[PDB]
């Protein structure tokens, strides 16, 4: 399980935690508003698929940070939505190929205002995600943290 950002920046492997800088494009929707689609920003593969299959889950306690710290919403993880901040462990995503594919994650916000918005500055913290990596033929089982930072200035709609 080895990942990088769309800008080309490596993300640590093997249990190291990371500061991960991403571009975001928030959008207002009926119901949940999109904060960031990480599936356009973080790409991952498996460098040893013949010998091991990787499984990755999002752990409880994953949450917004910075100016979004007080907000709730949902996380779409591999085609299903779950409460955010997370209070349970998601099902597993499988990595079994050397070909980069998205980390299939998008973060949404529950409307709490009438037409409000929150400015996110480039360089500021968006979210703190806790990941857990396991595999099929081993007992290796470790957790690590991705601090998600904004690359660009945006307005997140809260209405």
Swiss-Prot record:
It comes from Escherichia coli (strain K12). One of its GO terms (molecular function) is D-mannose binding. The gene is fimH. Coiled coil: none annotated. One of its GO terms (biological process) is cell adhesion. It comes from the Bacteria. Belongs to the fimbrial protein family. Involved in regulation of length and mediation of adhesion of type 1 fimbriae (but not necessary for the production of fimbriae). Adhesin responsible for the binding to D-mannose. It is laterally positioned at intervals in the structure of the type 1 fimbriae. In order to integrate FimH in the fimbriae FimF and FimG are needed. Keywords: Fimbrium, Signal. This is Type 1 fimbrin D-mannose specific adhesin. It is found in: Fimbrium. GO terms for cellular component: host cell membrane; pilus; pilus tip.
């Amino acid at each position: 399980f080895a990942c990088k950002t769309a800008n080309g920046t490596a993300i640590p492997i093997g249990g190291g935690s990371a500061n991960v800088y991403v571009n975001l494009a928030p959008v207002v929707n009926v119901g949940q508003n999109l904060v960031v689609d990480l599936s356009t920003q973080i790409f991952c593969h498996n460098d040893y698929p013949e010998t091991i299959t990787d499984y990755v889950t999002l752990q409880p306690g994953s949450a917004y940070g910075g100016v979004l710290s007080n907000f709730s919403g949902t996380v779409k993880y591999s085609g299903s939505s779950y409460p955010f901040p997370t209070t349970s462990e998601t099902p597993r995503v499988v990595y079994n190929s050397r070909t980069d594919k998205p980390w299939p994650v998008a973060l949404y916000l529950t409307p709490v205002s009438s037409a409000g918005g929150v400015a996110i500055k480039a360089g500021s913290l968006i979210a703190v995600l806790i990941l857990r990596q396991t595999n099929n033929y081993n007992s290796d089982d470790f957790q690590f943290v991705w601090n998600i930072y904004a690359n660009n200035d945006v307005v997140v709609p809260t209405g």
